[model samples]
Target: MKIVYWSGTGNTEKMAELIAKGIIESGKDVNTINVSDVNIDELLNEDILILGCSAMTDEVLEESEFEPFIEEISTKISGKKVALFGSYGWGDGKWMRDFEERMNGYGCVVVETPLIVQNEPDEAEQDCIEFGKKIANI
Candidate 1:
């Protein structure tokens, strides 16, 4: 499993790391990587896709990178199992909801519900850990 993410202020990055820890705790090997560093071809072969990004302005993805990355992979990732998570500073989790809908439209089987954290993930560390464990079980 790979926890690929784009973190502008490191909140989502921390979430990715904690989720990776949870996956390891469940006896699964997982990699947490920044989106900019991922190899697209290598990622396409992955069966499980775990993605994280903080909510951007107007309740959307980070346009400069993450959105473009998703767009690049969207067409080829049909039938893939995806797990989504993110940290938001404001706004309802409209970004996550729209993201889940878009993933579903792309023929992704999203695991459980998308996880959302407000501000720093420290407020919901256990939730993030448990969410990862649950994803591992799936």
Candidate 2:
């Protein structure tokens, strides 16, 4: 398993790290990658697609890099399992719900409801960890 994410202020990055730890603890090997650094084809090789990005302008995925990457993968990732997650600053976590539906439209099985944390993930550390372990089992 692998995690591909875009972190603007490191909040999402820390979530990725903690999630990976939980996956490892669950006896799964996982790698974490920044969205910009990930190779599209290489990422598709994994069975589960772990994606993360903080809520951006208009409460959407970060457009420049993360959004484009997701668009590229959407075409080729049908039948894949995706675990979506991110942090949000304001409003309800509408972005995560939208993202989950978008993934479903692409014919991907979102393992669970997408994980969302408000602002920084400090207090939500355990939630991220357990989310990882749960998805690893799926």
Candidate 3:
């Protein structure tokens, strides 16, 4: 399993690391990486993928990078086990809802509901770990 995340203010980065650690604790092999380093070819070769990014301005993805990567992903998305996590500034969770819909349309096995946080509350580390454990169980 592999997890990739985008963090502008560093909050999402910590969550990604925590999730990676949690998956390891759950006895699964996992890697945590920044989205900018992700390649679509590598993701296509994966059976399990974990994606993360904090909500950005205008209730969208980190735009400059993540959005484009996902666009490339959508072109080949089908039957891959996937999980999503993120933090938000202030939104009605609409971004997550829409993203879920998109992933569903791509036929991804979205594991559980997405784990979303509001800003970077200290408690989020637990949430991140719990999210990873849930995916591991799935």
Which of the predicted structures, 2 or 3, would earn the higher lDDT when compared with the native? 2
Q: Considering summed lDDT, which 10 consecutive residues are worst modelled in model 1?
A: 114-123
RMSD of each: 0.8, 0.8, 1.3
lDDT of 1: 0.92
* Candidate 3 pairs with clashing backbones: none
Model 2: runs farther than 4 Å from truth?
none
What does candidate 3's lDDT look like per residue over 1-138, in tens digits? 888899998888888888887889999898888988887787679777788888877778889999888888886878888888888886877788877888889888887888888888487778788888888887
Give lDDT tens digits, candidate 2, residues 1-138.
899999999999999999999999999999999998899988889989999999998878899999899898889999999999998897698888888889999999988888899888888999999999998898
Model 3 per-residue lDDT at 120: 83
Task: Estimate the lDDT of model 2.
Answer: 0.91
Each candidate's lDDT (Cα)?
0.92, 0.91, 0.83
Model 1 over residues 53-121: C-alpha lDDT tens digits?
999989999999999999999999999999999999868899999999999999999978899999888
